[PDB]
Design a protein around this ligand. Structure first.
Ligand SMILES: CCCCCCCCCCCCCCCCCC(=O)OC[C@H](COP(=O)([O-])OCC(O)COP(=O)([O-])OC[C@@H](COC(=O)CCCCCCCCCCCCCCCCC)OC(=O)CCCCCCCCCCCCCCCCC)OC(=O)CCCCCCCCCCCCCCCCC
Ligand SMILES: CCCCCCCCCCCCCCCCCC(=O)OC[C@H](COP(=O)([O-])OCC(O)COP(=O)([O-])OC[C@@H](COC(=O)CCCCCCCCCCCCCCCCC)OC(=O)CCCCCCCCCCCCCCCCC)OC(=O)CCCCCCCCCCCCCCCCC
Ligand SMILES: CCCCCCCCCCCCCCCCCC(=O)OC[C@H](COP(=O)([O-])OCC(O)COP(=O)([O-])OC[C@@H](COC(=O)CCCCCCCCCCCCCCCCC)OC(=O)CCCCCCCCCCCCCCCCC)OC(=O)CCCCCCCCCCCCCCCCC
Ligand SMILES: CCCCCCCCCCCCCCCCC[C@@H](O)O[C@H](CO[C@H](O)CCCCCCCCCCCCCCC)COP(=O)(O)OCC[N+](C)(C)C
Ligand SMILES: CCCCCCCCCCCCCCCCC[C@@H](O)O[C@H](CO[C@H](O)CCCCCCCCCCCCCCC)COP(=O)(O)OCC[N+](C)(C)C
Ligand SMILES: CCCCCCCCCCCCCCCCC[C@@H](O)O[C@H](CO[C@H](O)CCCCCCCCCCCCCCC)COP(=O)(O)OCC[N+](C)(C)C
Ligand SMILES: CCCCCCCC/C=C\CCCCCCCC(=O)O[C@H](COC(=O)CCCCCCC/C=C/CCCCCCCC)COP(=O)(O)OCCN
Ligand SMILES: Nc1ncnc2c1ncn2[C@@H]1O[C@H](COP(=O)(O)OP(=O)(O)O)[C@@H](O)[C@H]1O
Lengths: 347, 40, 107, 320, 121, 56, 459, 42
């Protein structure tokens, strides 16, 4: 599309998210979600092909259903109390409806099915936006109403998300589906700590966003969308593959990398509330994410796969466009564990 | 006297639509390289 | 079947290289004779002369911070005093019972 | 300021650059035809920019210094070995074919970039579209396998679906016996080994498959050896015809912006030429790959970006 | 703890006025040095990705990297110290105002405590 | 030759400088914990006429 | 403690700014200097500890492990110099960087005064080892090996982390000094049983305990020589150090929670030893012998007596040195023959006599010939076990006999008999290999003169 | 390609670094003085 129109649409997406984040009226939050959904569809469909169109319609149907149930929950809450302010939910049925709507907006299990297909259908830039920016508004709304969530439903959906992400990532050779399942598992980790501490949720979201931005930018730099295509990168730019390997090790929660900070903290917080079994199962299940990260690292940088002759021509050329903040994203996603006590800034 | 490195036969296990192929999945095909489906 | 029976273009496996062939007195450290000789010299000097001898001598003459001879002298003085005054050498109680308040059972 | 979204937003519109003479032109013919002289004369008369036919070391002439690199660092193939032993054990024939297609793709991208950046037209020899005839002949003579042509078809699909076909196709027609006499006169000992069958299949592919499909979306001017001697009538024919059937009139400023962002950034042009399809003719083992890549790095001016090589005479590296 | 609803809190203030009563972090703070090290690593990685001599490609760029990291780290350290000070202040005030929830434990001596003994055999 | 062998052997100062800096770092840590210097019941001592601290 | 940590960190820039042909020389010299500096930690007290700061402290249990860790690095560099000749400068620097990072992580782990800090560094040691195994390993099994070495470890250590934070929410501290001074008994309860299991299993899996040892033969036979050296000499002892530290909060549950492991060890040491009798790979045999020795160390730690702890410390140090020497000898054969099969290269005493002498001394030390410190540790453990139960001698006695057998077996198959006729590429031993063996074996015989240095804090 | 050291960008980067350093030092001094005044140290 025209660059002016693209910039306007991106600004509209961000403005819808910010309208959700700054408003105290339920109708304005709904309007922010509507504006975000309206501006999001062209961004997914920017490169026109049947796959992108299919992904856009799937995303539209899912988000429209979620927004309809969100409006229903708002109306029920207003019926049982003449309130429009986003606070305590005042009704269990309305709160269950709101939780389910926000879960489908986020892609938590069992509403996870659309995330892998939408991510596979769209390009890498649209996938970056969808997996990083499109999580802020529902998580902020969940943080604002955390004191009213039924912990049983929230914890059930979080544990299901962790399990589903871990199991679904094992079967994937497409990198975008791997990212989608990783996102589902990280969303489960984020939402398993909402009932106890929203600061932990925000810290996990920040760390995950940094890591996802770094990995998506590394995938864009080495324009690969499959495992075998990524296995050719060492013969053109081995530095990119080494950086990606360290980032993948960080994403697996291995200390002393940055990705260890959230789980650690979350586990600690859960233990402070006499919750022992669930964090144990959560770490056991995150082992699966680590396994398929390690498989990608094996195929990418720790071994050398066969190349092709036409790669020689590619040796004579350099990337014309360089993404700023990529080095900062890599450093922030690998080496911020010693600065862990900074979380008291209520990030 | 040489370190082992992956060959074509080793590299082909990651070229399918999914890992761990099954009877149901056996007919699945990887997406096109440019992710474009002929209009037919 | 006109296939070449070649799976890909690959280098042949090279033959291992003998360090003694191009350089007798090779010492097995490097193919460059000068770098090899100096690697041998630095390894031998800093391993045998410096660490193995001087460090062993340093460890041998470490001062008695574990206080073995101090304990021996203290025990000697205690044994002398207790044999002189008829006290029964070591006592069965480590702490004197005057400062322990046992709980009354009254069962 | 390099071209990008900001340049498009502020001032850069390529539609005002077109001046009815852009008209990308491609000239095709059989081996050792007079098409090169005709294309050079067309470029000279019309004021366009001539592109000599892309060879094995075309990419070397555009990067670093224009001097070609070693054969094992650039191309890994030779035409003389194909002429001597076309039925090669090492499958060099298809390696040469794929490398030549990639070179033609790079040259087409360069020509499109020049045309869209300056408005001046360009003249080309055998482009990517006409590249297939050699592959067809090489298949019918038994030099390559069917898997090779399938791989070529996949690559050609994913690459050529993203460019505008040429406005005018100029074909020179020469009889096979006359062209064999011309090869005899050339004196190149390696060229004297081409059988008449190879030339006949080249001509058959050209006539049966390439001419009619280009006649459906472009303007075609079929010329013989005699009437290609005078370029005045050729230029008169070029000016007389008007392009109204091709996709070029459909293009607008937005599509031009997209295609101009594509023609620069050569790594995106070359992206799908190395798809992970493992055919023994083109797949390279890890050890040889590592050795050759390390060798390439050693060459002066290749270790660091173009402006960051002290060996080459670059200065103020710390401050750049 | 959840100090989001703490009374008398300005909605979008990075550092309140009452934060100025606390000692500022020293310029040789080890955490500030680690932030500068992070900036230096970012500069080196920027050199490596752009395919430039890693150590000595852009000195101005590396200096800007380090300086920006140090600047943001200083302000972040100030905010973190202030937040921990608030936590401790509230804890002590609450303990003072609820004496019946935090009684003084009657001190006992090991000579009058009967602890069970488990032989190792 | 000075100013030429330096460009190759300046590397050999890094580890010893690290050792000296580590010793200096250790000394700094010691100052912070002086809360009980000359205050333990076992080593409580009266200062010498020209002594300020018992240990450093 | 920073007088050792800072130079180890400065090793990295020194490596990366070095000349292309001077990396090995500089690395070896400065690693030897760091080892000489770390030798000063051996001056210990009979009192509490060397509490340098709030973050690091040293003990007579930590000091010998630190000295061994700092001494192993130059030997690993010497052993790696040979097979990394045809490697690019950047990758050689990356290899040295991995070794330095491993040494830094180990140094900090031994001296950490906080259980959580200890856990973080104890896990940080995994990444360099995994990279070394899966990148510079030779066969195709290395990838699988790496996976095993990872997941086993993590499967044990994720529960520990949970337990650790739980403990800090109950006692209020994870500092080891406070934990020791404020220890309280563990009542017999299901919750306490599972806390015990969580605190114990992570250290059991890295010893390794019999039945949880499947990762070790894979990792040790697939690793490069430096990886094998560091895995056998130092990384195994992390579990022993951790169990020695953490058993202070597990009493009196250990009185009966130790029974399943003790059996698993006492029988296990038999099985693994017998496994060494029928082995066709040298590295596999050496790895299984390591498993047997570590089973003895597990028994010593579970018995929880002063003689047990002294013997366990001495045996840990002795086994580290001996297994590193044996792996180096096997690799010096492999680099000539490229097979790693015991019965291929035979009768090597005739072709390499001094290397045969090195083989004999290493086999004698592994056989626990008095007065080696191997036998000192073994005998102290055996006496403590006899006090625990007089029947144990039977199993212990059997192990002794079996050990000698397989040790001498390895010496007889490779060194004695007739040389293999068609193997004509066995060159004279280089000065580097002889110096490597000498630098392995001289510290052992020197340490037998002052055993109090390696007898731990209960001496 | 063929490019000289861009003096505009170098000057801007160096000026930004210097300005940030001076601002940070001034801010630290003011913080120290204000803390001392509030707590009545000096
Ligand atoms: C923390 C939470 C953060 C969550 C995730 C962050 C969101 C990242 C997405 C934002 C924009 C997308 C993007 O920049 O591409 C990804 C980008 C990679 O760049 P790229 O892949 O080369 O660009 C491909 C574009 O899609 C190619 O598209 P283009 O060529 O058409 O680009 C046109 C360009 C140029 O725009 C113009 O032409 C300017 C003209 C003004 C228009 C006037 C309209 C007013 C009405 O405008 C933009 O790129 C969009 C800017 C939108 C403004 C936002 C304020 O990576 C990042 O931006 C990472 C950002 C790091 C986080 C944000 C800052 C740290 C906090
Ligand atoms: C507790 C930790 C304590 C230590 C902290 C550790 C981290 C610190 C640094 C973090 C990152 C910052 C720097 C790295 C940038 C990457 C650039 C690079 O590749 O190196 C090239 C460059 C040399 O190559 P070049 O000739 O310039 O150009 C070659 C091209 O760059 C490209 O060359 P090429 O293309 O021909 O070679 C290709 C090669 C190139 O591939 C690479 O080398 C990429 C580097 C790895 C990715 C970096 C990850 C990001 C940070 C995460 C760190 C993880 C730490 C956590 C622990 C887990 C350990 C893995 O890739 C491969 O060969 C593929 C095989 C992969 C092998 C296995 C991969 C393992 C990677 C893990 C590395 C982790 C430690 C790295 C240490 C530093 C490495 C330079 O290296 C350097 O010389 C710079 C290193 C640092 C400079 C120090 C100078 C300062 C000295 C001044 C005085 C001393 C200061 C004290 C003051 C007081 C004195 C008075
Ligand atoms: C016994 C008293 C000795 C006093 C004199 C000084 C002895 C100096 C010993 C130095 C330490 C051992 C050095 C080992 C590396 C050898 C390097 C080498 O290649 O030399 C080639 C050199 C030149 O020969 P070549 O012509 O190149 O040979 C060609 C072929 O390679 C052919 O080569 P080969 O067939 O000649 O092979 C070398 C030869 C000898 O090579 C070795 O076996 C060396 C290792 C033997 C011991 C193995 C570990 C056992 C545990 C020892 C723990 C205690 C350590 C004491 C402190 C040591 C400090 C370093 O092999 C044997 O004869 C088998 C030795 C079996 C010994 C069994 C008894 C051991 C315990 C004895 C009781 C010790 C404490 C008594 C306490 C109660 C009374 C105070 O020949 C020699 O230097 C051989 C030296 C004679 C053997 C000394 C054995 C006694 C000393 C044991 C350790 C020190 C005890 C100090 C207290 C004595 C009272
Ligand atoms: C990988 C680590 C994360 C990196 C994050 C990106 C870093 C670049 C961002 C630059 C700084 C952004 C701060 C914006 C400036 C002013 C902010 C101020 O106006 O807002 C305050 C808020 O300030 C921010 O919250 C502090 C952000 C600081 C983030 C650092 C914490 C990172 C965790 C520890 C890892 C170490 C990272 C160190 C290296 C960067 C007031 O918040 P308030 O409106 O009243 O309450 C709403 C928030 N609630 C609901 C959670 C309570
Ligand atoms: C080869 C042919 C023969 C030639 C040689 C002939 C001469 C034979 C002599 C060789 C051995 C014979 C035995 C004679 C022993 C005499 C020396 C002995 O008495 O000294 C010992 C001292 O030995 C040292 O203490 C032990 C050596 C230190 C070992 C540290 C290793 C060095 C660093 C290497 C790296 C570490 C790797 C391992 C980490 C754990 C014990 O001394 P001790 O009675 O007590 O007190 C010393 C004096 N005091 C009272 C003033 C204090
Ligand atoms: C696989 C390779 C080896 C790996 C390492 C193996 C080491 C782990 C072994 C675990 C140690 C034992 C665990 C529990 C021991 C406590 C003693 C108890 O089990 O015995 C009786 C308990 O009776 C029965 O055991 C009850 C439990 C029966 C159900 C447990 C499953 C039994 C076999 C399972 C083995 C599976 C291990 C592998 C898991 C994947 C005592 O009767 P009681 O006085 O009433 O209970 C005393 C405890 N109190 C005081 C807390 C009440
Ligand atoms: C090499 C693979 C080894 C795998 C690890 C094996 C060790 C498994 C140890 C148990 C796992 C969970 C440990 C719990 C962490 C300690 C915290 C704790 O002890 O708190 C207990 C909580 O204890 C538990 O809840 C543990 C329940 C077990 C749930 C997880 C089951 C994992 C598998 C159990 C069987 C296997 C254990 C041995 C395996 C042997 C090796 C294979 C008390 O909780 P409260 O409610 O606050 O206090 C009670 C008074 N109100
Ligand atoms: N796709 C191809 N396959 C094999 N050879 C090719 C291919 N393209 C060009 N060539 C070779 O390029 C050489 C010169 O090109 P050509 O047009 O035939 O003669 P000229 O340019 O001198 O008029 C010829 O020897 C021709 O065989």
């Amino acid at each position: 599309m025209n660059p002016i129109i693209y910039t306007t649409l991106i600004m509209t997406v961000m403005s819808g998210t910010m309208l959700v984040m700054i408003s105290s009226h339920w109708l304005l939050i709904w309007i922010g979600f509507e504006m975000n959904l309206l501006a999001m569809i062209p961004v997914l469909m920017k490169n026109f092909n049947p796959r992108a169109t299919e992904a856009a319609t799937k995303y539209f149907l899912t988000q429209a259903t979620a927004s309809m149930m969100l409006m229903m929950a708002i109306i029920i809450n207003l019926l049982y109390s003449g309130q429009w302010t986003i606070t305590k939910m005042f009704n269990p049925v309305a709160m269950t409806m709101m939780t389910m709507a926000l879960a489908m907006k986020l892609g938590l299990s069992p509403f996870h099915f659309w995330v892998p297909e939408v991510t596979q259908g769209i390009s890498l830039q649209a996938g970056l936006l969808l997996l990083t920016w499109q999580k802020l508004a529902p998580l902020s709304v969940l943080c604002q109403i955390s004191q009213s969530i039924n912990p049983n439903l929230m914890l059930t959906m979080a544990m299901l998300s962790i399990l589903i992400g871990g199991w679904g990532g094992l079967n994937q050779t497409q990198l975008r589906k791997i990212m989608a399942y990783s996102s589902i598992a990280h969303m489960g980790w984020m939402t398993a700590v909402l009932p106890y501490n929203t600061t932990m949720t925000i810290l996990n979201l920040l760390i995950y966003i940094t890591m996802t931005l770094a990995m998506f930018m590394l995938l864009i730099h080495s324009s690969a969308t499959t495992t075998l295509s990524l296995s050719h990168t060492w013969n053109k730019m081995p530095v990119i593959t080494s950086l990606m390997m360290v980032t993948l090790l960080s994403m697996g929660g291995l200390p002393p990398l940055s990705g260890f900070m959230p789980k650690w903290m979350i586990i600690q917080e859960m233990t402070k509330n006499e919750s022992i079994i669930m964090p144990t199962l959560m770490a056991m299940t995150a082992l699966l994410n680590l396994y398929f990260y390690m498989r990608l690292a094996y195929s990418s940088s720790l071994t050398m796969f066969p190349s092709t002759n036409n790669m020689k021509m590619k040796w004579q050329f350099e990337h014309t466009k360089q993404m700023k903040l990529l080095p900062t994203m890599i450093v922030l996603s690998t080496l911020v564990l010693p600065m862990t006590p900074a979380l008291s800034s209520l990030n | 006297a040489r370190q082992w490195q992956p060959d074509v036969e080793w590299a082909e296990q990651f070229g399918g639509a999914v890992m761990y192929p099954t009877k149901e999945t056996a007919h699945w095909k990887p997406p096109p390289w440019n992710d474009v489906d002929p209009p037919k | 079947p006109p296939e070449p029976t070649i799976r890909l273009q690959e280098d042949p496996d090279p033959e291992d290289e003998n360090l003694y062939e191009k350089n007798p007195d090779s010492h097995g450290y490097d193919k460059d004779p000068i770098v090899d000789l100096w690697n041998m010299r630095v390894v031998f000097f800093f391993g045998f002369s410096i660490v193995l001898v001087l460090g062993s001598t340093f460890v041998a003459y470490l001062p008695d911070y574990r206080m073995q001879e101090w304990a021996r002298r203290e025990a000697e003085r205690l044994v002398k005093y207790r044999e002189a005054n008829g006290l029964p050498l070591m006592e069965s109680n480590c702490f004197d019972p005057n400062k322990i308040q046992l709980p009354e059972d009254e069962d | 300021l390099q071209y990008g979204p900001l340049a498009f937003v502020l001032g850069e519109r390529t539609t005002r650059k077109l001046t009815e003479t852009s008209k990308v032109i491609t000239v095709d013919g059989n081996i050792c035809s007079g098409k090169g002289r005709l294309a050079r004369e067309i470029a000279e008369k019309l004021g366009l920019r001539h592109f000599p036919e892309a060879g094995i070391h075309y990419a070397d002439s555009t990067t670093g210094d224009g001097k070609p690199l070693d054969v094992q660092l650039s191309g890994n193939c030779s035409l003389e070995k194909f002429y001597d032993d076309p039925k090669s054990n090492d499958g060099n024939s298809y390696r040469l074919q794929s490398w030549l297609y990639a070179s033609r793709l790079l040259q087409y991208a360069d020509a499109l970039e020049h045309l869209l950046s300056t408005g001046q037209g360009v003249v080309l020899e055998r482009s990517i579209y006409s590249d297939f005839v050699f592959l067809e002949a090489m298949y019918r003579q038994g030099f390559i396998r069917k898997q090779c042509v399938e791989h070529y078809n996949e690559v050609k699909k994913v690459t050529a679906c993203e460019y505008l076909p040429p406005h005018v196709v100029v074909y020179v027609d020469v009889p096979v016996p006359e062209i064999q006499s011309r090869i005899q006169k050339k004196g190149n000992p390696h060229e004297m080994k081409i059988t008449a069958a190879y030339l006949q299949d080249i001509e058959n592919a050209y006539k049966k498959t390439f001419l009619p499909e280009m006649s459906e979306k472009c303007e075609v001017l079929q010329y013989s050896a005699r009437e290609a001697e005078d370029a005045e009538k050729v230029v008169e024919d070029i000016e007389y015809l008007k392009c109204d059937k091709g996709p070029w009139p459909d293009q607008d400023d937005r599509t031009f912006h997209r295609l101009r962002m594509l023609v620069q950034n050569k790594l995106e042009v070359l992206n799908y030429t190395t798809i992970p399809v493992y055919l023994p003719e083109i797949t390279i083992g890890a050890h040889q790959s590592d050795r050759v890549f390390q060798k390439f790095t050693e060459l002066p001016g290749r270790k660091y970006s173009p402006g960051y090589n002290e060996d080459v005479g670059d200065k103020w590296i710390w401050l750049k | 703890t959840m100090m989001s609803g703490r009374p008398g809190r300005v909605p979008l203030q990075f550092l309140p006025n009452e934060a100025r009563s606390l000692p500022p972090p020293k310029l040789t703070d080890p955490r500030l040095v680690y932030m500068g090290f992070l900036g230096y690593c970012s500069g080196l990685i920027d050199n490596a990705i752009r395919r430039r001599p890693v150590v000595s490609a852009g000195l101005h760029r590396q200096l800007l990297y380090v300086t920006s990291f140090v600047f943001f780290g200083y302000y972040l350290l100030k905010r973190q110290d202030y937040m921990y000070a608030l936590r401790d202040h509230d804890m002590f005030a609450y303990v003072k105002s609820h004496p019946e929830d935090f009684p003084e434990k009657d001190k006992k001596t090991y000579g009058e405590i009967l602890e069970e003994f488990h032989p190792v055999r | 030759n000075v100013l030429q062998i330096v460009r190759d052997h300046w590397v050999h100062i890094l580890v010893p400088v690290g050792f000296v800096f580590g010793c200096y770092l250790d000394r700094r840590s010691d100052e912070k914990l002086t809360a009980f210097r000359n205050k333990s019941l076992l080593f409580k001592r009266e200062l010498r006429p020209n002594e300020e601290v018992t240990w450093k | 403690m920073l007088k050792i940590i800072i130079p180890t960190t400065m090793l990295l820039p020194m490596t990366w700014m070095s000349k292309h042909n001077m990396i090995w020389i500089n690395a070896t010299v400065h690693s030897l200097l760091i080892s000489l500096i770390s030798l000063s930690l051996l001056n210990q007290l009979g009192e509490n500890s060397l509490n340098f700061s709030l973050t690091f402290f040293s003990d007579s249990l930590s000091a010998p492990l630190l000295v061994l860790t700092t001494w192993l690095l130059p030997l690993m560099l010497m052993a790696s110099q040979s097979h990394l000749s045809k490697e690019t400068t950047t990758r050689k620097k990356l290899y040295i960087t991995m070794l330095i990072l491993l040494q830094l992580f180990l140094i900090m782990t031994f001296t950490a005064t906080e259980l959580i800090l200890f856990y973080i560094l104890f896990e940080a040691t995994l990444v360099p080892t995994l990279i070394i195994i899966t990148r510079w390993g030779n066969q195709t099994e290395r990838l699988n090996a790496g996976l095993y070495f990872l997941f086993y470890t993590l499967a044990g250590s994720l529960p520990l982390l949970v337990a650790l934070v739980y403990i800090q929410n109950t006692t209020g501290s994870l500092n080891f000094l406070i934990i020791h001074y404020w220890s309280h008994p563990l009542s017999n309860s299901w919750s306490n049983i599972f806390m015990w299991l969580a605190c114990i299993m992570a250290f059991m899996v890295k010893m390794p305990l019999y039945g949880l040892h499947l990762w070790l033969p894979k990792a040790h036979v697939e690793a490069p020589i430096a990886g094998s050296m560091v895995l056998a000499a130092v990384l195994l002892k992390l579990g022993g150090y951790g169990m020695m530290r953490i058993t202070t909060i597990l009493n009196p549950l250990t009185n009966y929670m130790a029974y399943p492991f003790l059996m698993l060890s006492m029988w296990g040491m038999i099985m693994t030893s017998s496994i060494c009798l029928r082995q066709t790979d040298l590295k596999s045999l050496i790895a299984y012998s390591s498993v047997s020795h570590m089973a003895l160390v597990i028994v010593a730690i579970m018995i929880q007596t002063p003689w047990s702890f002294m013997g366990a410390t001495a045996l840990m140090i002795a086994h580290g040195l001996t297994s590193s020497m044996l792996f180096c000898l096997a690799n010096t054969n492999y680099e000539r023959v490229h097979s790693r099969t015991m019965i291929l290269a035979r009768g090597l005493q005739t072709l390499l006599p001094l290397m045969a002498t090195w083989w004999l001394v290493a086999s004698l030390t592994n056989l626990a010939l008095p007065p080696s410190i191997n036998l000192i540790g073994e005998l102290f453990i055996i006496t403590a076990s006899f006090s625990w139960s007089n029947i144990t001698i039977i199993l212990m006695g059997m192990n002794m006999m079996i050990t000698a057998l397989y040790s001498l077996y390895m010496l007889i198959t490779t060194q004695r008999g007739k040389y293999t006729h068609h193997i004509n590429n066995i060159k004279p031993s280089f000065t580097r290999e002889n110096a490597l063996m000498a630098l392995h074996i001289l510290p052992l015989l020197l340490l037998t003169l002052n055993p109090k240095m390696i007898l731990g804090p209960l001496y | 390609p063929h490019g000289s050291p861009d003096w505009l960008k170098v000057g801007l980067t160096l000026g930004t670094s210097v300005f940030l350093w001076i601002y940070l030092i001034k801010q630290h001094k003011e913080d120290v003085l204000e803390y001392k005044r509030r707590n009545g140290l000096e």
